[PDB]
Design a protein around this ligand. Structure first.
Ligand SMILES: O=C(NS(=O)(=O)c1ccc(N[C@H](CCN2CCOCC2)CSc2ccccc2)c(S(=O)(=O)C(F)(F)F)c1)c1csc(N2CCc3cccc(C(=O)Nc4nc5ccccc5s4)c3C2)n1
Length: 154
């Protein structure tokens, strides 16, 4: 439940930044994790994503795209090991795929990408997350981004 809630919150937040409204982006026991993931995704996208190969050039999702194709491109993030920055990059990449889907009139793919992300998180990332301090350690590492909060009037 918590991992699905994190996926749906992040995707709702990323869609909101492009004027799109999806459910699941309101609190709950994972509120601090949702906030840290949202801020880390923004900070990654603003400053650090530019250093890396743009995964959106390799995967343009249509209703015929298979999970296996998404899995192979997402695997590039983790080939040299899982870490928190690569996990944030995975959420950011899923968010960009959802924005592209709505932009292209394929909004039915948002729920499919959310399911694909929850499956990938479960199969490939959760053992690392839970044996490397859990989401609690990610929150401790990231803290809060006061400059971004001030910029957004938060
Ligand atoms: O090793 C890494 N990072 S790390 O060293 O572990 C670290 C560094 C600092 C931080 N956090 C500070 C936080 C400092 N602020 C200061 C202000 O107050 C708040 C804190 C800076 S913000 C940030 C930077 C990187 C990642 C996430 C966030 C945190 S982090 O946030 O995960 C941590 F929790 F560890 F802190 C992790 C790292 C990150 S990504 C990465 N890879 C390597 C393998 C690979 C291969 C092929 C392609 C890509 C790829 O990403 N392509 C993409 N294309 C698209 C296209 C569209 C949409 C999304 C995407 S993503 C990548 C990405 N390797």
């Amino acid at each position: 439940q918590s991992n699905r809630e994190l996926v749906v919150d992040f995707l709702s937040y990323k869609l909101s930044q492009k004027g799109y409204s999806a459910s699941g982006g309101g609190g709950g026991g994972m509120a601090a994790v949702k906030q840290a993931l949202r801020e880390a995704g923004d900070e990654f996208e603003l400053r650090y994503r530019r250093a890396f190969s743009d995964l959106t050039s390799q995967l343009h999702i249509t209703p015929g795209t298979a999970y296996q194709s998404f899995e192979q491109v997402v695997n590039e993030l983790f080939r040299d090991g899982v870490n928190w920055g690569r996990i944030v990059a995975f959420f950011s990449f899923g968010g960009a795929l959802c924005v592209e889907s709505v932009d292209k009139k394929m909004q039915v793919l948002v729920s499919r990408i959310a399911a694909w992300m929850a499956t990938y998180l479960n199969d490939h990332l959760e053992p690392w997350i839970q044996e490397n301090g859990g989401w609690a350690t990610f929150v401790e590492l990231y803290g809060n981004n006061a400059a971004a909060e001030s910029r957004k009037g938060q």
